[PDB]
Point group: C4
Chain length 25, copies 4
Amino acid sequence: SSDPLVVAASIIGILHLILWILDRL
Amino acid sequence: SSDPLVVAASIIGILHLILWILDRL
Amino acid sequence: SSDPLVVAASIIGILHLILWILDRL
Amino acid sequence: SSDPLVVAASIIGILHLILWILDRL
Ligand SMILES: N[C@]12C[C@H]3C[C@H](C[C@H](C3)C1)C2
Ligand SMILES: [Cl-]
């Protein structure tokens, strides 16, 4: 288990890489 | 719970995405 | 122990830096 | 506590933002 803020940052991180990849594809 | 280092990096990761969006718009 | 979604985001974050370094060079 | 893979990704995430700022400034 993890802190809700860490879970929130994990969702944000995944979206970050997706947008970063799409911004180049 | 999460380690303090993980909580700190979570805040930093959120900041990182916010900065990337603002810098992309 | 960490939430599985946090472990997934950790793997994705590590990949993110690898790709980021490769794309800048 | 947090998984070592999460701790590693936290260190790497912090380093990632540092490099992003330096390259931005
Ligand atoms: N990039 C991340 C660092 C830390 C571990 C994992 C989830 C959160 C917090 C964002 C990847
Ligand atoms: Cl955790």
